[PDB]
Amino acid sequence: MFNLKVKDLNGSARGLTQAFAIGELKNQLSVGALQLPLQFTRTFSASMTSELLWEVGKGNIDPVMYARLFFQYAQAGGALSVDELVNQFTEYHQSTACNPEIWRKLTAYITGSSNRAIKADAVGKVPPTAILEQLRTLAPSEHELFHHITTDFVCHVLSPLGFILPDAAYVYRVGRTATYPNFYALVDCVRASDLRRMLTALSSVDSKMLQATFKAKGALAPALISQHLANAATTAFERSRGNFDANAVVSSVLTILGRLWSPSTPKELDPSARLRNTNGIDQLRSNLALFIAYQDMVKQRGRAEVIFSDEELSSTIIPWFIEAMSEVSPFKLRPINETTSYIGQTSAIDHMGQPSHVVVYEDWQFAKEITAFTPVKLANNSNQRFLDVEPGISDRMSATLAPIGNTFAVSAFVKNRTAVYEAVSQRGTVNSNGAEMTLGFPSVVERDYALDRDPMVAIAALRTGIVDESLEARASNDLKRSMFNYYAAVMHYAVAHNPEVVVSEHQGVAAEQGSLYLVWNVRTELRIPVGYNAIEGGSIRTPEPLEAIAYNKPIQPSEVLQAKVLDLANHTTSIHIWPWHEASTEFAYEDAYSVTIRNKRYTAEVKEFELLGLGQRRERVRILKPTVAHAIIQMWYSWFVEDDRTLAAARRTSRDDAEKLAIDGRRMQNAVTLLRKIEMIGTTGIGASAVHLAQSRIVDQMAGRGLIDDSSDLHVGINRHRIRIWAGLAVLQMMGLLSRSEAEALTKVLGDSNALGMVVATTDID
């Protein structure tokens, strides 16, 4: 839940405004003075890609995912750039491929014979950990990811010969890929293609002729192996050599797109009719991810300069970039209507038709699986440890979380916001301010849970535009990437729902030469402007991508948004080096149920192992964190509390009779559905066991006091509906899905309505 004023959008939400995107700290940005229309029809979006685990210790070389591990080691490791990383890798590969001594020494080691041939029967086995440990000494570097890529190259070319043990395995995690390409991401997608051309020549080395002469003769000298490896190393090194700067390719192909996008380019510096008729410029011209990447380029750099020969060189640098993009990459070209279909929109309407509140939300799918593992060391002062999954606990919690996913839809939250805003509406037009916008993105709070980050700093980043410098790099570098993604996704939604876009050029203060921005030409049939513009002429021209959402109709999401759980079950024998401790949580819990029976209070404690079917308190086990479930439940809670606070604010100043009865009936209907929801949770696996244990702890405490059994018609029903509400809160307390402060405030809201009394009043008969 992020609340913004659509009128004071500068001081309200600067982190998503286009003035901030092209360098306006002030509010000064023009209406469409000088204009040039454009029609976007494609975009480079990433796929539906989430993070996963991949293992490197085997004899395979997968070039796309070694490229991906370079991405994560360069960016998410705090290193310089994947451009510099691929440059040092080319230097390393040149030094080991143009050196004949190395490919003799580490074949002498892994064959055992320096000068004399080996027979076909006296063939032993050396594990790849040993050849890695001596490759570290022979060919030194400072990056382990080069020694891995050399190790499994030589294990790939020796594995049919039978000189290596297939035993060991070893696994890293790969990270989260952004959807919308930055300038730097375009540079990196050009370098990653050249690295993939490097590695796919190493991946094709067969040693079929070496195996054939081994079988035919019975023996082979180590010099044939040392030649057959050092030939293939140089065949990849020959692919490595003779490349373009990715920076100077992308900066030159984005600058000429700027100069033929803008309406006010000088006649001097202006692309001629040859390069303008380059095969492919007509497709890169109507592309939107390139527009926002151009804005980010001229934002960061400030200006742009050409280096290449602008007549014949640049008319054959462009299809190299087209091939780098059109290759299998993270970023694929798609139509503009495809990439942003999980967004939905609704609004609260006046009698004239004007919006008062507008809600924009992401449509999610509740993930309902969960895993419990235990970490097992290998040796002391060595973080090589690996970790064992435990069925019979993860199965219990999965079977408990699977009914809770069938009651927490995301459409049924905005559908309750709208009923609130239609039930508390007066009869009077809205003129004093624009229609305030709430945007419900569970992904913000989900990354706040996933990185252990305060939500105040993300809300502050979206509000005042800037990020904080106090927090560390592994959270700031994800905050800035997330913030760029939200700006880009807003503009894809706005352009895909208002395809009438017209490019201007900002030159008011003009701290740059030319920095472009769209405007929209949405037709409205309204009279009073939301935001601040002029509504003249049957249509409005607005520069900002959020007001163009504030004039739409209700839109329905066609696709859910999906996050998948990480994979500990399949590879359970490998050792784990990725940080398992940030993505797992400690699981221990204590709760207690109290009830007064004729002026005497009875308390029943309960622990988590008694609920989980365990007898012994185990203390090593850790749950992999349910961030999607927790984020959906947090958005639901914050919306429930906000709706109740607005109805309590409007019931006091209603000053009417029928509208006052409507507000009161709305509150009662609201609280009884909340109570039935929690009580339906408290009949699941953990909840029913908590009931059957807390009842036993109560009953064996009434043992000394002889008391007469009660009516057993209503009294059983009342005590049943109270114990189930307690169990339903306790299970969401014990899984991380609810804090104790918010469970306590939710209990206060349910208690001050006499909601259990109004529910039991419909289990009587008069």
Binding site: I466, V467, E469, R740, S741, E744
Partner: protein, 148 residues
């Protein structure tokens, strides 16, 4: 190069501090590592925002507003200046053995706080029990008259 938006308020405050005293000019010249002359250190301030921030750390009486303005404009000068500006504070000899005497007692505070709820719930429960009896009697009499 320092941006003019910072420089407009940053330069005359440093110049007024130099006109107040020249004894800090030798201090900032030995601190940054430039020439002792005011024109040389002012050119270093104009050409490097890190040198400007180190001068606005050496003087902070009048240069606090200019320091905040350079802070709000450039973040990277702050990210480097927190590392370049670090004074290890003096520690007492009795500090860790003194802190060992409170282990028995912070545990007792937390074992109360887990039961009561929050820290604020503990403080408000402590105040409510330490409160006077006549407030309880006033509460009972307002409930007797029919108010809640």
């Amino acid at each position: 190069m320092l941006l003019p938006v910072v420089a407009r308020a940053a330069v005359p405050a440093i110049e007024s501090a130099i006109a107040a005293t020249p004894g800090l000019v030798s201090r900032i010249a030995a601190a940054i590592g430039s020439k002792v002359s005011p024109s040389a250190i002012l050119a270093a301030v104009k050409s490097n925002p890190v040198v400007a921030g180190l001068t606005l750390a050496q003087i902070g009486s009048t240069g606090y507003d200019a320091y905040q303005q350079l802070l709000e404009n450039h973040p990277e000068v702050a990210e480097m200046l927190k590392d370049l500006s670090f004074k290890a504070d003096e520690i007492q000899p009795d500090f860790i053995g003194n802190l060992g005497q409170y282990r028995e007692e912070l545990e007792l505070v937390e074992d109360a706080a887990r039961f009561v709820g929050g820290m604020s719930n503990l403080i408000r429960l402590r105040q409510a029990l330490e409160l006077d009896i006549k407030y309880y009697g006033l509460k009972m009499q307002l409930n007797d008259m029919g108010y809640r």
